[PDB]
From TrEMBL, chain A:
This is ShCas12k.
Length: 605, 85
RNA sequence: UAAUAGCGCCGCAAUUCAUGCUGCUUGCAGCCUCUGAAUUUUGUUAAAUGAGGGUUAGUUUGACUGUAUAAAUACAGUCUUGCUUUCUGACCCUGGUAGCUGCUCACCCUGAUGCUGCUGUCAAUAGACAGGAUAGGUGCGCUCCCAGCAAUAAGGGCGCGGAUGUACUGCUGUAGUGGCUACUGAAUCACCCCCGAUCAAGGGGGAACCCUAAAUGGGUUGAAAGGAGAAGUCAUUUAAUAAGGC
DNA sequence: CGTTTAACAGTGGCCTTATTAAATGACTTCTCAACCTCCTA
DNA sequence: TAGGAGGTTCTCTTCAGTATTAATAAGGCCACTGTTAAACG
């Protein structure tokens, strides 16, 4: 999995774009809105929320009677498919971030029940804490998942108290019979995490997009002309009147690569037309850096044509493509203001012939497993047999190789690992360490990786404060000049990713190790709240202003973006990314060294 | 709101010679401003700095109407009929 | 006149180290000359930072083939398209005319993440004119400090009217400060100038340097990076509402 | 030789809180079809 | 034939969450009493 998106503007006539804008902003986005609303009020909805899997076909079932509707009719089939796919993905996400949140809440409740002090454990067990300690050592002799299973499995007060004592230290036997206030703060922190997860689980339903803003305009008339009767209704009117009038239709996900048919203009320019809309021809305006992808698209489609469809589109360097509208600055009709943009998702691994072989092996394994899975059932539907036929068709067609560039992949020395330490102040720090002999081959810092570019790092912090102030000075004036250094941060993290992967290449690394951070901006919020609740007992504003800057620094600390960028570059290059635990205490260099060493140690089994 | 308009609306919602600030007059002023602003909001859909003002005027008029309703329902009804709210 | 003091950032040092340098003694010895790392430690006659607003389908980072090269990388050949961003420059500006509209002010006191702070000329009014990014303070900035204003933070005081059943109002001139739309002023660029397109388009004319004796002969006249869409959530701030919310 | 002004140091009081919306910066999740059939030219 | 528009359907097996091992990094003024250390008749 090394999917990356390239983009290109699409240029055509004013009418060719009026057709698309009318056909999406007026018929496709309303279809997505109605599909979302219907998905919400479906009777099985609360069942889906219990799982993370919305059923495979439900969204299409609510769409089949919707295609013939008076206000949703007059669309290509592969665009009803776009709407179905968008809504299905929205609710495939929304049922996976609420199921895992519920799992976290359940686990945190179990841990809150787990947590007892030394005195509390003594009074519950009815024995001296020394017996608790001895039995806890005994049970540690007989990871944490096993202990939680043991606790949830037994009903004895003594054994369960032993589990509690063990997991209080984290499968450790610490004999420092002190710091009861520390336990009080820890229990307070766990309770705050419980409260925050509960506050999260009451989430808004997927909104959808209202381009017409009919509700806004109607509510303005209701609020001005009439008078509300209670506060709870005037508040709803106010909330509606302040909502954001979105003005961009949903994209068009074309999950089939061939739905975009490519051609060469009489001027040599590349051109696209999509399945269902062939009278609409769009001319590709890319940049030369992205030219080879589009030329590969045209060459691959022509190569499939010239073999009488003996070649499997499915090894195409194109996987799918969104067809979005950007936002333009100025005035005029929307088709003349917003720039149509094609976002093609390409499997970079397929560019080389050698990587194409890897992709071929992956697909030929997964799809023959699919064939075996369908061959056990005896239902033998007709379209099910059509699917079975297509699977063997892809099997047969996959062994016909297109002519692609050749690069002998990347032979990686398994010993030499790369450990990356992230931090609030040192965004990254890399240690190239050989595992056979623990001596680090090399160290680099945030000034070494950003060489000649290190000035950016300071300029990121110098102005992200400045912009943070400028926004504040413009909000009170209600000017739209709210700017932020998100692009600068993204550029800096991309530079770091390139530097780290280049360093791994130079020393012939066999892996890259990144820490598993977990919920990092939440644990610090909980800890700061717990500390401020004693530092400020009854003053909530004081509990908030306490460690404000530290918390906002954590929240804007983009560990996830940096990890994703490094993962993208390593996958593009072939470095096998692993994971480890960042040591809690230590210098960044030692942190990275021990991180990579631990990753190597755990990998061995 | 223009001074001439305020004087005219005070006189035309007047209860006597000197009643500026009577709940009827305050509701009349707020209603006049909101009625002028609704067209501006039909046209300029980006002027949020006026959106906050509109919300404030709506809430002020709502409070005034509730107060006058609790005090004197008769005056409340005749007022809400005069303004057609 | 004042910017004291604090905080953050750079540099300049000093020290100790190595991820450095040296040496083979190949993991040890020394050294801080470069490169860095960690402190503290000063703001030098200075080093490096540096935050008023804008302007290019700008340039470079590119693909394939072959060679040397294990590879990077270099060279040679063929192709080239303008996407989205980050810098570095260069250049322009410190806006006008109309409308629509928000807020805030009886009068005080304290004073906010409040506003203002450039050069010169004329005034020395409160404003024009020319210039202008060096723009109050410290090497550079701040929500910090100074200075003035402070109604547009919040709090307290407090006069007269109307209301006074819990809501609250007027003392208010476009007066100050904001927002929106429409037409307009300049840059519309990447060595310079001109004509042109900008859902498309480039064309031409010069300069300097190198090669070349010289030939618009040919070349050069700043660099980088890309995984996007959708949906939620967190945080900060702002504003309205509420007196809990259910 | 005792002493009385500067110079820090610890203490007590104050400080409101929630909901929706927006802007920004982040985070999390999901996705990243492929061959076939038919119907016109 | 050859383009162009529609059809179609499941994966994998499910089912993952709960631990720590610190320490960062805590208020900001306003006003007061209390100590404390150094210069001086």
């Amino acid at each position: 999995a090394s999917q990356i998106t390239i983009q290109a503007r699409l240029i055509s006539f004013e009418s060719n774009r009026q057709q698309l804008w009318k056909l999406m902003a007026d018929l496709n986005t309303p279809l997505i809105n109605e599909l979302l609303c219907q998905l919400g009020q479906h009777p099985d909805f609360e069942k889906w929320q219990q799982k993370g899997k919305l059923p495979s076909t439900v969204v299409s079932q609510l769409c089949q009677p919707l295609k013939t509707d008076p206000r949703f009719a007059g669309q290509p089939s592969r665009l009803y498919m776009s709407a179905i796919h968008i809504v299905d993905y929205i609710y495939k996400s929304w049922l996976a971030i609420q199921k895992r949140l519920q799992q976290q809440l359940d686990g945190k409740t179990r841990w809150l029940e787990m947590l007892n002090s030394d005195a509390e454990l003594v009074e519950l067990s009815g024995d001296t804490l020394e017996a608790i300690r001895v039995k806890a050592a005994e049970i540690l002799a007989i990871l944490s998942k096993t202990l939680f299973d043991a606790y949830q499995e037994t009903e004895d007060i003594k054994s369960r108290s032993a589990i509690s004592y063990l997991l209080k230290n984290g499968c450790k036997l610490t004999d420092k019979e002190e710091d009861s206030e520390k336990f009080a703060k820890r229990r307070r922190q766990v309770e705050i995490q419980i409260q925050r997860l509960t506050e999260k689980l009451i989430s808004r339903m997927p909104k959808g997009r209202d381009l017409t803003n009919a509700k806004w305009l109607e509510t303005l008339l209701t609020a001005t002309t009439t008078v509300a009767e209670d506060n709870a209704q005037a508040k709803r009117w106010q909330d509606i009147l302040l909502t954001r009038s979105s003005s961009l239709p949903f994209p068009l996900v074309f999950e089939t690569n061939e739905d975009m048919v490519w051609s060469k203009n009489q001027k040599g320019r590349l051109c696209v037309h999509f399945n269902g809309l062939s009278d609409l021809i769009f001319e590709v305006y890319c940049g030369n850096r992205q030219l080879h992808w589009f030329q590969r698209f045209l060459e691959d489609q022509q190569t499939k044509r010239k073999s009488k469809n003996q070649h499997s589109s499915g090894l195409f360097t194109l996987r799918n493509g969104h067809l979005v509208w950007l936002e333009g600055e100025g005035k005029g009709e929307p088709w003349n203001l917003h720039h149509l943009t094609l976002y093609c998702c390409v499997d970079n691994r397929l560019w080389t012939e050698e990587g194409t072989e890897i992709v071929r092996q992956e697909k030929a394994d997964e799809i023959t497993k699919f064939i075996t899975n369908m061959k056990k059932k005896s239902d033998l539907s007709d379209t099910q047999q059509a699917l079975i036929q297509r699977k063997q068709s892809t099997l047969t067609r996959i062994n016909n190789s297109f002519e692609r560039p050749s690069q002998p992949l990347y032979q990686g020395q398994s010993h030499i690992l790369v450990g990356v330490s992230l931090g609030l102040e040192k965004p990254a720090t890399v240690a190239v360490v050989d595992a056979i002999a623990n001596k680090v081959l090399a160290y680099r810092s945030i000034k070494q990786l950003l060489g000649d570019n290190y000035e950016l790092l300071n300029r990121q912090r110098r102005q992200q404060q400045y912009l943070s102030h400028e926004r504040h000075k413009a909000q009170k004036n209600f000017s739209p000049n709210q700017f932020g250094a998100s692009e600068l941060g993204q550029h800096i993290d991309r530079l770091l990713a390139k530097a780290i992967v280049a360093l791994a290449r130079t020393y012939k690394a066999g892996s890259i190790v990144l820490p598993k951070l977990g919920d990092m901006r939440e644990v610090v919020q909980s800890e700061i709240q717990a500390i401020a609740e004693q530092k400020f007992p009854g003053y909530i504003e004081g509990q908030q202003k306490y460690a404000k800057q530290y918390r906002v620094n954590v929240h804007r600390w983009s560990y996830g973006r940096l990890i994703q960028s490094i993962q993208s570059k390593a996958a593009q290059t072939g470095i096998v990314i692993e994971e480890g635990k960042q040591p809690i205490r230590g210098s960044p260099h030692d942190k990275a060294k021990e991180l990579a060493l631990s990753a190597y140690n755990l990998r061995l089994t | 709101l223009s001074t001439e308009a305020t004087a005219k609306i005070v006189s035309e919602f007047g209860r006597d010679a000197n009643d500026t600030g009577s709940t009827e007059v305050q509701v009349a002023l707020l209603t006049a401003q909101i009625n002028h602003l609704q067209g501006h909001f039909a046209e300029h859909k980006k002027d949020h700095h006026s959106r906050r003002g509109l919300l404030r005027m709506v809430s002020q008029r709502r409070k005034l109407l509730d107060y006058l309703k609790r005090k004197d329902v008769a005056r409340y009804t005749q007022l809400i009929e005069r303004l057609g709210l």
